[PDB]
Structures are given as structure tokens and as C-alpha cells.
Amino acid sequence: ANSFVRAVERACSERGLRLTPIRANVLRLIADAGKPVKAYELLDWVREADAPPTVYRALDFLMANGFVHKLESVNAFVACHHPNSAQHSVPFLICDRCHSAVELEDRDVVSQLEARAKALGFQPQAQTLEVHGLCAKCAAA
Amino acid sequence: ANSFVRAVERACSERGLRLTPIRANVLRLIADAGKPVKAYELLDWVREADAPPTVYRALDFLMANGFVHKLESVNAFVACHHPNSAQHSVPFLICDRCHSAVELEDRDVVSQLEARAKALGFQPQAQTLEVHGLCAKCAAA
Numbered sequence: 001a002n003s004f005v006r007a008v009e010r011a012c013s014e015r016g017l018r019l020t021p022i023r024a025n026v027l028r029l030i031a032d033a034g035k036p037v038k039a040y041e042l043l044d045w046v047r048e049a050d051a052p053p054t055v056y057r058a059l060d061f062l063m064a065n066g067f068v069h070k071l072e073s074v075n076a077f078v079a080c081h082h083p084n085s086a087q088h089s090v091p092f093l094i095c096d097r098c099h100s101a102v103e104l105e106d107r108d109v110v111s112q113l114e115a116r117a118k119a120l121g122f123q124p125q126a127q128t129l130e131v132h133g134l135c136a137k138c139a140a141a
Numbered sequence: 142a143n144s145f146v147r148a149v150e151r152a153c154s155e156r157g158l159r160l161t162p163i164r165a166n167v168l169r170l171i172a173d174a175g176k177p178v179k180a181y182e183l184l185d186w187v188r189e190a191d192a193p194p195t196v197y198r199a200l201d202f203l204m205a206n207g208f209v210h211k212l213e214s215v216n217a218f219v220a221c222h223h224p225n226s227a228q229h230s231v232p233f234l235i236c237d238r239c240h241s242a243v244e245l246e247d248r249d250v251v252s253q254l255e256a257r258a259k260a261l262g263f264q265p266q267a268q269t270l271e272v273h274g275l276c277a278k279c280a281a282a
């Protein structure tokens with residue numbers, strides 16, 4: 001949480017990149033929210049000021065390096081729970097009702113879909129895998 | 142193509158529903174495009190006139206009954222290649238460069254992700270599975 005930035009902070013020294021204060025505050029804000037964050041919410045909270053395109057390029061950096069995931073079906077961002085997995089494709093369980101998002105890791109599923117793609121000549125690079133339905137709390141309500 | 146509507150036309154009698162001319166023209170337009178269609182493009186072409194919320198409810202009907210899929214990562218619609226599969230979760234290969242979308246069917250992949258979900262208490266209902274990269278034509282260019 002507060003430590004998580006520090007963990008990401010040395011995942012960047014350890015390769016070409018560096019975590020500017022702006023990237024750290026964006027990362028910290030997303031990690032602290034505990035539901036997926038809309039881009040306009042992140043700007044609001046980073047104004048608690050930086051020009052907006054500065055925060056948007058900090059967000060791009062976080063995404064290209066796999067520290068933040070964009071959830072395509074809700075158009076919202078979440079911090080990667082394990083950050084030095086480089087960039088990676090993983091399933092998310094996204095509750096329809098409370099909007100929580102849980103990040104899994106399945107290499108069998110991603111490998112199967114790669115094989116499916118390559119057997120039709122498609123050269124596959126990043127997969128969007130989002131499972132919808134209800135989390136345990138909401139299903140029990 | 143022209144026949145495809147007729148095929149969907151009797152997939153609807155065969156259960157509670159009916160394919161109004163408006164739903165048929167929306168379905169026909171999407172099926173004829175051969176790339177994913179944006180909602181505002183569909184309205185343009187259905188104006189070739191109907192009030193827009195009429196076409197948007199025809200689109201909703203098509204989606205709820207599994208005749209049209211919304212691709213979440215490109216915010217665009219495609220006709221289902223095999224329509225009486227009820228509503229279903231299936232992978233799509235979506236080319237990053239030419240934007241073609243190919244609809245597959247994998248019951249192993251969808252079943253695995255259901256099991257993953259249920260083992261954490263999540264009750265899973267519709268999955269978004271979209272594989273990105275380059276189709277064979279674009280990879281060869």
C-alpha cells in the first residue's frame with residue numbers, strides 16, 4: 001500500500017525506468033482505492049496542481065510497464081497486485097454489482113488462447129480476459 | 142448474409158421472440174459490414190427515418206439474444222456467426238491494425254475460467270475474451 005509504491009519503486013531501478021513523483025502519486029492513488037478508478041477520478045484526486053496531460057502520460061507509463069491494468073469492460077484502472085510480472089495477460093473477476101475486480105494468474109488459459117490464435121495464423125499479443133458475474137459477498141446478499 | 146437474416150428470422154419464431162423490420166435491418170447492416178461497427182455508424186446507415194432510441198433498443202434485443210456481440214476492447218458490434226448458440230461466451234481474435242474480428246468457440250477455456258471463479262466464491266456469468274495482436278494478412282505485410 002504505502003509499501004507497494006516502494007516495492008514498485010525498486011522494480012523500476014532494476015530496469016531502464018524511473019518512478020517520478022508524479023508516477024508514484026498516480027500509482028499510489030490507484031493502489032489505495034480498492035475499486036477500479038476512472039481516469040477523471042484520478043485527475044480529481046491528483047488535484048487534491050499538475051496539468052492533466054502530465055498525469056495521463058504517467059498513467060500510460062504505468063500501463064506499458066504492467067504496474068496498472070486497464071479493465072476494458074468497465075473503462076477503469078487497477079494496480080497490478082504483483083508488479084514485476086513484466087507486462088502480462090491475466091483474468092480478472094469483475095463483480096457486476098459492487099464493481100470489485102480480482103486479478104488472477106492462469107498460464108494454461110492464456111497459453112490455450114495463444115495456441116488457438118496461432119493455429120489460424122493470427123499472431124497474438126495481449127489478451128483481455130474479464131469474467132463477469134457476482135462476487136461472493138453480492139451473491140450471498 | 143441476405144440469407145443470414147432469414148436464418149436468424151426463424152431462430153426467433155422458435156422461441157418467444159420476433160424479428161421486427163427494425164431489428165432485421167439493424168442485424169442485416171451489422172452482418173454486411175465485415176468489420177466491427179460503431180453504434181454511431183449503425184445509426185448513420187439506418188438513416189440511409191427511425192428515431193435513434195428505436196435502433197438502440199433493436200440493438201439491445203440483438204445482444205441479449207446473442208445475435209450480435211459487443212466487443213468491449215474496441216467498443217463496436219459484430220454479428221454472431223452462429224446465432225442459435227443462445228447467448229454464450231467465446232473468444233475473439235481482434236487484429237490491432239486492420240480491426241478484423243474473428244469469433245471462435247472454446248468450451249475448455251470458458252469452463253476453466255468458470256472453475257477458477259467458482260473456487261474463489263465468485264458466481265460467473267458472461268466472459269469477455271478478446272485476443273489482440275495481428276491477423277495473418279497484417280503480420281505478413
Ligand SMILES: [Zn+2]
Nearest residue numbers: 080081082103
Ligand atoms: Zn498484474
Ligand SMILES: [Zn+2]
Nearest residue numbers: 095098135138
Ligand atoms: Zn460484488
Ligand SMILES: [Zn+2]
Nearest residue numbers: 221222223244
Ligand atoms: Zn456468437
Ligand SMILES: [Zn+2]
Nearest residue numbers: 236239276279
Ligand atoms: Zn489485420
